[PDB]
Amino acid sequence: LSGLANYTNLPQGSREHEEAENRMGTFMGVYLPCLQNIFGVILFLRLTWVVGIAGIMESFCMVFICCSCTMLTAISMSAIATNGVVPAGGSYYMISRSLGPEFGGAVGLCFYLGTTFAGAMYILGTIEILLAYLFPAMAIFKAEDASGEAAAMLNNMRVYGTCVLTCMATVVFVGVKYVNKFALVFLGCVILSILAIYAGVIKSAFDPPNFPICLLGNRTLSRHGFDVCAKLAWEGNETVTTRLWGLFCSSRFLNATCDEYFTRNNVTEIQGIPGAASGLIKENLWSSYLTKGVIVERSGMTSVGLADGTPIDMDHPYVFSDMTSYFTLLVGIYFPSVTGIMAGSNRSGDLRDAQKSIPTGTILAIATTSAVYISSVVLFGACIEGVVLRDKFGEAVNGNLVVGTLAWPSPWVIVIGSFFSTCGAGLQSLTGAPRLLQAISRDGIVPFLQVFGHGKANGEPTWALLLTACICEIGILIASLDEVAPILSMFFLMCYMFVNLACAVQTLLRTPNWRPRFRYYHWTLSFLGMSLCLALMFICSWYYALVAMLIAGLIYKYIEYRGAEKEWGDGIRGLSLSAARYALLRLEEGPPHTKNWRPQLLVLVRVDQDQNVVHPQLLSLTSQLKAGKGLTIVGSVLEGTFLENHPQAQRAEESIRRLMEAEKVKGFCQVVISSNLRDGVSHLIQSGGLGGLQHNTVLVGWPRNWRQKEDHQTWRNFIELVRETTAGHLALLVTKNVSMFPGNPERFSEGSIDVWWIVHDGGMLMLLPFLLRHHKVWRKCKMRIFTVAQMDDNSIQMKKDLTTFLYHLRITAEVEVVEMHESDISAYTYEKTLVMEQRSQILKQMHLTKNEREREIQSITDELTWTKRMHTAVRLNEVIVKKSRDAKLVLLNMPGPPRNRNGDENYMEFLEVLTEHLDRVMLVRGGGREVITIYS
Amino acid sequence: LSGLANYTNLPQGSREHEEAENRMGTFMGVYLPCLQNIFGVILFLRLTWVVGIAGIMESFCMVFICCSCTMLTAISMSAIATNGVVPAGGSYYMISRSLGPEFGGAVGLCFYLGTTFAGAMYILGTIEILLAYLFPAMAIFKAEDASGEAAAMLNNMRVYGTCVLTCMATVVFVGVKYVNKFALVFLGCVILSILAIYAGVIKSAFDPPNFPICLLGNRTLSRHGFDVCAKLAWEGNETVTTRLWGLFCSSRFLNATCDEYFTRNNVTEIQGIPGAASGLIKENLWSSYLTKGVIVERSGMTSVGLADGTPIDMDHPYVFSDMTSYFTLLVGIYFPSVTGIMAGSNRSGDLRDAQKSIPTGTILAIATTSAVYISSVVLFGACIEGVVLRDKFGEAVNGNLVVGTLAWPSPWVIVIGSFFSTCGAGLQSLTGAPRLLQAISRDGIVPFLQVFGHGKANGEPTWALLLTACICEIGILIASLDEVAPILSMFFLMCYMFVNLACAVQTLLRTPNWRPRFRYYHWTLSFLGMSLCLALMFICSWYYALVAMLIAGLIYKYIEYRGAEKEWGDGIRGLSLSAARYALLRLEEGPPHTKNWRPQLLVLVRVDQDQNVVHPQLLSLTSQLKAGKGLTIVGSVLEGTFLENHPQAQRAEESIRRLMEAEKVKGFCQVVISSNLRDGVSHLIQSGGLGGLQHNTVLVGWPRNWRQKEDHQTWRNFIELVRETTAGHLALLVTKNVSMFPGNPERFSEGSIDVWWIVHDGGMLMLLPFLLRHHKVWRKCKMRIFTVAQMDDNSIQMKKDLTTFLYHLRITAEVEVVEMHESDISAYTYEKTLVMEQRSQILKQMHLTKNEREREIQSITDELTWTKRMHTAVRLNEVIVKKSRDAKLVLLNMPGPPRNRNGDENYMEFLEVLTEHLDRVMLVRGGGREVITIYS
Ligand SMILES: *[C@@H]1O[C@H](CO)[C@@H](O[C@@H]2O[C@H](CO)[C@@H](O)[C@H](O)[C@H]2NC(C)=O)[C@H](O)[C@H]1NC(C)=O
Ligand SMILES: *[C@@H]1O[C@H](CO)[C@@H](O[C@@H]2O[C@H](CO)[C@@H](O)[C@H](O)[C@H]2NC(C)=O)[C@H](O)[C@H]1NC(C)=O
Ligand SMILES: *[C@@H]1O[C@H](CO)[C@@H](O[C@@H]2O[C@H](CO)[C@@H](O)[C@H](O)[C@H]2NC(C)=O)[C@H](O)[C@H]1NC(C)=O
Ligand SMILES: *[C@@H]1O[C@H](CO)[C@@H](O[C@@H]2O[C@H](CO)[C@@H](O)[C@H](O)[C@H]2NC(C)=O)[C@H](O)[C@H]1NC(C)=O
Ligand SMILES: *[C@@H]1O[C@H](CO)[C@@H](O[C@@H]2O[C@H](CO)[C@@H](O)[C@H](O)[C@H]2NC(C)=O)[C@H](O)[C@H]1NC(C)=O
Ligand SMILES: *[C@@H]1O[C@H](CO)[C@@H](O[C@@H]2O[C@H](CO)[C@@H](O)[C@H](O)[C@H]2NC(C)=O)[C@H](O)[C@H]1NC(C)=O
Ligand SMILES: [Cl-]
Ligand SMILES: [Cl-]
Numbered sequence A, B: 001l002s003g004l005a006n007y008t009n010l011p012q013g014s015r016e017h018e019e020a021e022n023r024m025g026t027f028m029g030v031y032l033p034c035l036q037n038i039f040g041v042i043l044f045l046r047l048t049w050v051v052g053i054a055g056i057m058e059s060f061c062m063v064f065i066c067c068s069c070t071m072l073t074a075i076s077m078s079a080i081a082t083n084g085v086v087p088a089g090g091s092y093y094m095i096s097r098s099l100g101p102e103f104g105g106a107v108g109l110c111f112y113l114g115t116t117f118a119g120a121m122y123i124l125g126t127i128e129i130l131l132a133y134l135f136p137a138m139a140i141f142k143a144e145d146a147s148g149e150a151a152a153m154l155n156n157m158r159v160y161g162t163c164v165l166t167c168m169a170t171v172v173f174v175g176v177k178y179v180n181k182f183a184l185v186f187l188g189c190v191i192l193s194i195l196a197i198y199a200g201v202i203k204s205a206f207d208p209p210n211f212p213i214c215l216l217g218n219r220t221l222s223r224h225g226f227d228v229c230a231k232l233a234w235e236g237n238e239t240v241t242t243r244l245w246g247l248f249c250s251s252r253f254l255n256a257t258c259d260e261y262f263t264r265n266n267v268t269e270i271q272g273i274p275g276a277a278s279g280l281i282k283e284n285l286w287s288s289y290l291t292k293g294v295i296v297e298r299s300g301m302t303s304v305g306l307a308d309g310t311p312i313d314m315d316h317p318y319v320f321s322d323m324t325s326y327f328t329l330l331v332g333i334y335f336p337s338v339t340g341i342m343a344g345s346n347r348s349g350d351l352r353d354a355q356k357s358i359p360t361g362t363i364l365a366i367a368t369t370s371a372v373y374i375s376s377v378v379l380f381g382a383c384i385e386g387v388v389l390r391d392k393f394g395e396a397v398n399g400n401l402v403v404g405t406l407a408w409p410s411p412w413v414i415v416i417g418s419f420f421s422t423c424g425a426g427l428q429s430l431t432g433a434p435r436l437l438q439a440i441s442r443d444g445i446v447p448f449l450q451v452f453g454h455g456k457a458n459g460e461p462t463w464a465l466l467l468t469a470c471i472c473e474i475g476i477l478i479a480s481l482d483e484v485a486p487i488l489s490m491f492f493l494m495c496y497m498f499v500n501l502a503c504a505v506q507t508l509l510r511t512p513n514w515r516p517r518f519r520y521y522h523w524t525l526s527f528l529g530m531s532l533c534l535a536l537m538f539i540c541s542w543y544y545a546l547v548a549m550l551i552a553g554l555i556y557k558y559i560e561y562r563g564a565e566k567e568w569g570d571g572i573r574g575l576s577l578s579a580a581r582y583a584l585l586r587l588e589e590g591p592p593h594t595k596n597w598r599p600q601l602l603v604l605v606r607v608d609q610d611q612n613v614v615h616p617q618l619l620s621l622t623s624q625l626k627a628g629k630g631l632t633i634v635g636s637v638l639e640g641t642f643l644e645n646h647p648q649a650q651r652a653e654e655s656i657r658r659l660m661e662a663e664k665v666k667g668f669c670q671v672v673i674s675s676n677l678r679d680g681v682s683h684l685i686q687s688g689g690l691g692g693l694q695h696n697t698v699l700v701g702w703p704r705n706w707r708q709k710e711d712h713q714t715w716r717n718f719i720e721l722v723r724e725t726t727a728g729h730l731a732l733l734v735t736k737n738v739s740m741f742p743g744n745p746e747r748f749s750e751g752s753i754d755v756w757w758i759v760h761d762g763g764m765l766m767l768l769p770f771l772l773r774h775h776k777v778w779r780k781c782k783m784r785i786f787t788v789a790q791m792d793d794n795s796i797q798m799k800k801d802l803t804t805f806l807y808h809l810r811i812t813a814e815v816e817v818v819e820m821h822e823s824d825i826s827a828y829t830y831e832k833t834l835v836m837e838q839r840s841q842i843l844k845q846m847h848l849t850k851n852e853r854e855r856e857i858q859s860i861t862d863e864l865t866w867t868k869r870m871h872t873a874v875r876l877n878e879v880i881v882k883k884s885r886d887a888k889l890v891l892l893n894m895p896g897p898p899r900n901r902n903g904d905e906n907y908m909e910f911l912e913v914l915t916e917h918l919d920r921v922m923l924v925r926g927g928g929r930e931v932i933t934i935y936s
């Protein structure tokens, strides 16, 4: 078709990434390289053995929790694909560009260790097929002709595993273009072998395949060694013994001295593969765990037993178990039969729509190998009987591969068909592993690896091959599948767990550039799949899971330390520099800030001619209001230029540092040399903070001695600060008589705290006495609430809503409604009428109706010129001082500033007549955009 | 003494904390309440049993790793004591005030669960002594008189454990003052019992205590049930059988039909406690692990064995094992014998020097119980033989407590002496546990617990007693020591691990208010002790350690979520708000910032009359310089007041947001409405950032069209910015021809980058071309280095140091030394001469000499008026443009600004003649306080 001349199941790596600085639909580029790294030697060498030991409903469940593991990791990888633009280079560049260089050096290094131990599991599966089924005469170590054949079997896999690994790691050094060419014969040998196996089980429902086994009375024998079973060889006229007699008795002379189990029992011959038609699921759907050295023993037979001490004599031709078996041992052997799901992203800079091919091409290439493994375990447990399943190496059927004796041609279709694919999977993983190590050490995220990025011309790793040919050597010296198999399955389960974790902590915390766009992500499938990866990590080996999880987390913190040492300059200083910046960039997203207002505060203090703070008691009121929580920035302004008044600001800086550590204030300090104090104050209200760590209110003193002279632009700077916060939508706390405010160890014995509503923000006016009584100074004071009502309304019902609001919150205050009818209150009500419904649009976008419009007053209660007739607060101040003149703290809402600046001094002498004969006052001012629904 | 009338080993709790808002030396207040909660029932009921099974050198090692665990946790608790002022209230307030409310609600809640399961381990030890040694006739359940006595033993501990727990949880509800009075009889019963046991082993070296056991030929018998052993009862004239015969044979008729092991074997009588003098350490220093149901079998005897199938008949009077035993089972039973180290901080608001009593009073009260347990295991394995150690409940010695048969009076000194102390330890822990739950729910850190802080008058918990009397019930229904014992030992190991971890991550990261002042802290002892707590957590039960560690970490994140929901207002927004603030407060400590300078940058951009950025190519030069790393703040200034020009700043804000996301800039934006641009720029240079997240350099354009007119205060604002950064010690990058600078996808094919030194900062001048070539635009350009030398020096050697500097760093540049002799260079050299040695004091406090003064040039190389004779850069510019006129980027150090402002326009036309006929120039300016030793 001339498009299949570019098949290439190999991964891209580093060379196709650097050349993208300056064709493959779904089937040929994603789906087929994924259905070629998934199918492997466990399907042809171990899946019959685990269904004979676990049975169905224990193999059926371990193929259902090992496949539902990798299905949920496949969803999390499809979110990484549909995030950015899918860079060219493979799976290392596609993950570490959407999860950061820390979650990419840890997934990227647990993956190189997984495939370099998979590459030892394929060379181990090569010599198993070459020594047990192809050529069992090349075996160079024959131990003693005794029961000590286990050690010579291991020492034969160590001299041939080394000789194959040397020749395999020198084919991919000179013949890389040839191994790329031969990638289509490997996919054919896999796909032909699976079609052969499903072929013969449809033939078996009509014609069974005729493989016979021989039982010495409920004991399975090894057919290698004798010809005909029969025990007698009747032969016609005279009878002479068989060769089966010659292995159990003293000689072939027919006289005497045979052994005891041989003499009291007969022999039998049954069909080892009794077709799919025989009702063999029933007597094969339960477990049969065995111990090392146990005869396999077909159940349901006669077997007169010796009932003696059983000197079983491990030299007779029996079939013994070679290892003890249980459920959690089988999961670590079966698990590498589902790995290979990062192969759908091998060719990511070759597709035409890589955000559509990588999702559907790996979800379908997983759901179709699940339909093979689930249907193989039912059909193997309905066509073969148990004692032929329960031995590997096929001793009951004369040295034939047990899955091979089910194919439509002779069993050499599967024996050669598995020999080449296990050779072409260890040639693949010995190229894809030293490519990924070369891709890691070019990025420089791990600085000691940096000589494993060197190559020859045209890429093609030269030193990373030498390291991979030594790590794969120590899986050859172990020399056993069922030992190398659960080791690599821990490394693959580790990297599938860090992928699932990183994609779930970023959707919750809302990291900035992360959009999955997939369709079915929902953040919990990546969390539920993480909960299955470490569950399966524990039941393979908890002493393996606990050490592969610790050094993965100990290279995560080596990326962050070395990455911050070059980003900011020094190491341990940079970890906190990087943690603050990343938390700030997370804040700027776009959704609104908060639906429960909390004063952040920005304290404006004044210093004097030798730079000491003028009123230090303003800083102790912040300590009694914040109690260490939130943000607090203190700011002072000097006059002059920076160029010659800067040492006057070095020591004005440290005098607020030394004083906010003595009044126990937790926050930051900013000292600014402006040319005048009018705009230098106005700057700090604008640029206070960094990003989302910005202030919310201003706390400033009162401009006392304003009326005299010689401070003429001090009270004109005050009224311009009231207008700058109404336009900037901040809030305002101004404290009159700052020197009368208590220090930290003074502790008012009793008394009260009065609040006056009038007709404005109560959520801001009930929260401030609430927060004050969490301090040891204001703990013992009561709290009385005075609200001013007009008339023509009711008030009688207004106080009822006030009482249940305190009942629903347990504040234990008391209310009293004072009433005006004439123009006593007009600086509050007259100038604005629409704020009642202007407040409503602030709470309509708030989107809370179910029991959240309760626990929030103001709304539950809502039920003649400044210039020289004007506003008069004498009738208002006379009713305030009649009931609050000795109350330790009064809280008032101050009225809104006038429009035209011709009434800027009629406004200041409204605030003096309002608050006369009152000792400690604190005037508040709203901003409209404050709701408080939960009172801490 | 009338000071011992205030002994009170009970903990303080919540009442003594709220009353400290408004006498006990070391021995009586720390040391003795610590030597009373440590000594317990494992010393009297299980320590003999574990030394008979493990032997010495396996009991010797598990008392050495369980005591060295709690010794290192005792050091970490002595750092918490010598940090603040040691508040009043106990151990909950002392930890959660120096480790935060998150490491205090997790240590504080794993501790309440530990003592409420210790309180079930004492009521279980009460009914064991009352049913096996005191009154073995109160047993209300007698099963079948068969081998099914294990179930009736458990059902007898469930009806008496419930009846004692009801009466114990109603003594501490009405008689709390009496239990406080009786705390001195409990310390006496403990201290008298230990003096009794060490007494009898000195008597045993001269007089053994005479306790006899009887062996049926290598089989230990149960002496309860028969009187004299002897098997015959010769009696004088006629012989009639014993009662030992009557338990093994059919009747007492002397005829026949006895059992087979009884008939072929004799009986024997040996001393069960053969003194300290017998050489019995040898035949007792090795393990003897047994299985459930095994006869104990004293080794080294004759014992003609049956060699048959052994119908052992578990109804004969034998001594059988009741459980199977191994090494990691014994650690979970032995471990609660060292807990009780938080008792030295029970009375913290009662001492006189609490920072000196709590260290020495718990270190010595741990080192002296280690001398008891280490010396008990040697002396128990030299005075008792193995088959009396290897049975609990004392069946071989006729129902006597095995540690009781070693005391100087009759063994009832230990039997009553342990009955009262285990009763006074379950009365203590049933008061200290519902006090700590009441201390937790007053703080409000866990909001659903808040009804367990309610009390009656005078404190004294009323509902927390009801919860503790139901959690302790489910340790009564388990009804077995050796089952409740490893459960509580997991909770105590959990809280000792979070204490050790929190004290090691704060010393490394340098959290602000943390000073240990102790003497021997060194941060690694708290880390090495953490490495032993979770090691011991795994070898008790890994399926218990894995679930007690998960819900401890799942209340840590419940403290942080609910604590940030009230600190900032909304929940998941506040986690990132709190993480940014805490990382910023960590930065302000006092040590200097960095010894490897990295440009942080602060870009000053200009907008126009409809608020679009004037030169957008200044923002792409930051992307090509930072590449996403570090901090970058862009700042623009408008003219006017805030009160009417603020919507002009809303949309000037979003036009830099929409443009710094398109040029791929990562950072923050600040727009400021000043009254003039001179001080509004000067403010941003001062207050740029928050805390330690502040800028380091300024990147600004060039004031083109300065010479004409109508922009007269634009170039006067420029030269004032050069002086404001020299005084403020910042650094400066000014770019000429900003529109000629390349965009992001333009990718220079080849070319060069030239740099000219002259005679100043090269660390800042080699780092900027280094960082530029990490981008795809400047990757392919070369890098030539031109340095200007004077004369009378050498230069010949200067270029040699330049070449090895690039050899030691692999930059692949080339150098060339151009030379001047006359006054060509005088704007650089003439005005300042002392900067060579002024630089030296900057690097003397740097404190780096060992190979760090290499890899840092500038120092390795150091080997006539401005006003209208002046400075002339025509001879300098003619040699620049001869060699660099087509070089894609030139870098120059600009000279220092003049002192007097009369030469402010002779300075600007020095910068125009210096940089004429050059297309892309970038002038740099130092600051003195920049060293770069590692070039990324
Ligand atoms: C049973 O064993 C005896 C050995 O004692 C066999 O006896 C000899 O067998 C050889 C075999 O060729 C003959 O040449 C001898 O003549 C036999 N000698 C005697 C004394 O019998 C005997 O043949 C064996 N039984 C059978 C049936 O072969
Ligand atoms: C071994 O096989 C033989 C078959 O020849 C069994 O012999 C038969 O046993 C049954 C049951 O006792 C008898 O009814 C038949 O008459 C026997 N057949 C002959 C030809 O004699 C023998 O029982 C089997 N052994 C065991 C232990 O089952
Ligand atoms: C194979 O034969 C043995 C006898 O040699 C069977 O074992 C006996 O099994 C029964 C089952 O109830 C027990 O009661 C006997 O005690 C066993 N006897 C001995 C000597 O162990 C065995 O069951 C057979 N195998 C299978 C799979 O059934
Ligand atoms: C051995 O057992 C026999 C029972 O068969 C005993 O014989 C009887 O024992 C009773 C016991 O008092 C006598 O009254 C009978 O007279 C005995 N009868 C006979 C026929 O002996 C016998 O006594 C037992 N052996 C001994 C030594 O007591
Ligand atoms: C049980 O104890 C008796 C002691 O009466 C042992 O009998 C002695 O055995 C030794 C060794 O055979 C002889 O030398 C003595 O003569 C025996 N003593 C008498 C009085 O006959 C008897 O051996 C012991 N049983 C076992 C199994 O050791
Ligand atoms: C108690 O006696 C038994 C015999 O009843 C001893 O067991 C034998 O131990 C030897 C040791 O080498 C073995 O060779 C035998 O096979 C054992 N016999 C049986 C029947 O098990 C046993 O050793 C004695 N106990 C101790 C602690 O020594
Ligand atoms: Cl994979
Ligand atoms: Cl403790």
Ligand SMILES: [K+]
Pocket: A038, A039, A040, A041, A042, A043, A336, A337, A338
């Ligand atoms: K497979």
Ligand SMILES: [K+]
Pocket: B038, B039, B040, B041, B042, B043, B336, B337, B338
């Ligand atoms: K103890």
